[PDB]
């Protein structure tokens, strides 16, 4: 996993040249948006359980998935679903602070898909829950930060799908 700074340093080391005006401008773009990302990080950190709870309520509670025969039908399976939503929210926050999607692939998407096959987890309901979590996060953090969160959330959705 790497940040924007890590990515640009890797690129310019592969090229073998110092950081030019373009790289410095991208670094300034990353640092200027730093305060916004940190504020959204405050918001997600403080209200993470509220966000996950709202996402579960809007996406999962009264669908047949929580009914017997559904994948969420157990105290253990429901708790595991909420735990997965906690994973997605926390690692989306990590990706936002990093301003990169590599940590999502390495930490969250590494072996998750076929693991969901084996456990019997439905992909589409998971993507729906991720989308609902994205809506809740955007609502809590405002449009500017929600736009950034949307990239990481639909990255997770595409990785699942």
């Amino acid at each position: 996993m790497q940040d924007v700074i890590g990515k640009v340093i890797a690129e310019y080391d592969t090229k073998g040249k110092y950081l030019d005006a373009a790289a410095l401008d991208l670094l300034r773009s990353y640092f200027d948006s730093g305060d916004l990302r940190l504020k959204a990080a405050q918001a997600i950190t403080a209200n993470a359980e509220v966000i996950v709870r709202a996402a579960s309520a809007k996406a999962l509670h009264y669908t047949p998935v929580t009914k017997p025969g559904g994948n969420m039908y157990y105290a253990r399976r429901y708790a595991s679903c909420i735990r997965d939503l906690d994973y997605f929210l926390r690692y989306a926050t990590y990706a936002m602070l990093a301003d990169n999607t590599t940590l999502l692939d390495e930490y969250v998407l590494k072996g998750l898909t076929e693991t969901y096959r084996a456990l019997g987890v439905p992909l589409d309901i998971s993507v729906r829950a991720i989308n609902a979590l994205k809506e809740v996060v955007a609502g809590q953090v405002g449009p500017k930060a929600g736009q950034e969160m949307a990239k990481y959330f639909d990255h997770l959705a595409k990785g699942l799908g």
Binding site: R76, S80, R83, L112, A118, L119
Partner: protein, 57 residues
């Protein structure tokens, strides 16, 4: 009959874990021959499913 390449997924039934535990549940590992009987027994008693095993050497 030296090494086994084992891809296995061990779920969790006793509780829910807050840490990552994704590589701990699904993983591929190289296991020696003298150890593979015990390792297979441990995986089967944990409730995990052995997805595949192959001969490397």
């Amino acid at each position: 009959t030296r090494l086994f390449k084992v891809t296995a997924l061990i779920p969790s039934y006793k509780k829910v874990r807050g840490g990552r535990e994704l590589q701990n549940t699904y993983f591929t590992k190289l296991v020696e021959y003298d150890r593979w009987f015990a390792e297979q027994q441990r995986i089967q008693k944990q409730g995990g499913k052995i997805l595949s095993v192959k001969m490397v050497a």
